[PDB]
Symmetry: C2
Subunit: 306 residues, 2 copies
Amino acid sequence: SGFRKMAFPSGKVEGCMVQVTCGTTTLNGLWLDDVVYCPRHVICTSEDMFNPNYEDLLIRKSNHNFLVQAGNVQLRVIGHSMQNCVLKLKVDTANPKTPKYKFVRIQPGQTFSVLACYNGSPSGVYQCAMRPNFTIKGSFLNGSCGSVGFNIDYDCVSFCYMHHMELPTGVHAGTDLEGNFYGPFVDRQTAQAAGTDTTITVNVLAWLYAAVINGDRWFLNRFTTTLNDFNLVAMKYNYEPLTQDHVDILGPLSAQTGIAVLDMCASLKELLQNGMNGRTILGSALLEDEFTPFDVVRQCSGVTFQ
Amino acid sequence: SGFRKMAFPSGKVEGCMVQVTCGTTTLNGLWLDDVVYCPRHVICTSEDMFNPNYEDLLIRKSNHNFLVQAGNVQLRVIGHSMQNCVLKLKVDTANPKTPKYKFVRIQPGQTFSVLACYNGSPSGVYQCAMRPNFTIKGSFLNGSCGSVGFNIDYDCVSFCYMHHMELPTGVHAGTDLEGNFYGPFVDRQTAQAAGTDTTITVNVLAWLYAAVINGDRWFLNRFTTTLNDFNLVAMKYNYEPLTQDHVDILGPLSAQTGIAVLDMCASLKELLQNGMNGRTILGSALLEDEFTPFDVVRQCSGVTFQ
């Protein structure tokens, strides 16, 4: 019982976090086997900011220009290259605490745990969703660049996000671990702004299911509706359209509660049109959209057939 | 910028979690040096829970009745004893990952991180608060007992909670690591239930500061009030009293924002009576009380000594 914004245990990623210095710029890197990955913007000075020439800046740097520290231990850089916006520093020592891992690119609507770090030292861990407009609503201060987001999928650490920057609305933008930005952003100081966001409908429904599992029922009505009619209401309140895939994805939560997906859709329609009757659901006074169906399952159901 | 429910990195605590089986009950234990700490109710069958005499149930048990497992490696139990409601199993092997640690007893209002575990395997990490009525609104499933809560100062893990049971309302009760329960609860199947809970006023205020710091201002007014007047309003709405110790603790944030504490109390008062008239603060439509002033400062680092 209970429901909380729960992140994955951070231990396997903590052991990969390093500090990377280039001139007067320090930020975080991720150390897997004999490679440290970090934002390429660490090689910039204030004079590069206008039109940074990364290709040129990279070749002009020697291995010695990169100070890499894992705790107190200095790692020697023996090579440097660039994949898109991520810098790959080859080092002389392979990380003995390298977990089994993969680099994955997540989709909008999906969540992951962020390990916020500073000077290569983990500060804290929290859950984020990739917003439909490809930002995350994170929590980062100066020196957090290079912090990474991940999921634990079986035994495997699936790394999906590396932090690059804050946009002027206070939201956050970054790349996958191959250095490609989520969204239409670039790793330089230019006029760029988040597109308008939408609410992740399938996640809201999952969160409602979570409420039902934990004994919140007041918003349940006896109504059912159709995909089509639901989607018309969705659009009116800036909610992403719902698809059959979404309906399928909610199946596990339907079975737990005995509430058909389309019935929960009718309950959601009613909360949208008429509000939340001054009540809270799972310690919140608005409709939460940053929990996937899987996040609800992993927290509230597990492997229960019974 | 940004503000999130953020937990400490769980790595140091992950390396201490182990499984403890006695009979058909499996739950979690904490392995520090050559001692495993777990809830003493691991030795009870379902029947014993009604009226259990642990002193007597313990006599029935030999060392061989406890199977302790760190991953797959069996730790031989060579001693078993009992301090209040926690069992201490002396094992043959000292935990090589034992971090620097203290046992501390926290007070209502203070926050900590929970490493939710199952069969000695970490599942997730989230932030909680010791409620004024000595419960926590955690998120636990079957097999979570013996999961622990902690703060991390430097490399020092301060353990403050071990999880023992779910009360009927879905909220959670447990002990410090010396086995004393928080609040008047007991490890027996009885009529017992949580006292009625109140909101943690000083936390709400810290959060409001966090909001100002992150650009949310609409709830500010120009009024000032006094402690006395404020506390009268507090009492009406089941807020905890605000003391002058709380007023000083908020001095840093008052300074940073240039909003006097009693000014902020006046803003809260208005929110308290009248609500948020359809607006949000830090992405929430209610008053959050699970961030301490310290939690706020950690995510909203000042520029004083930057």
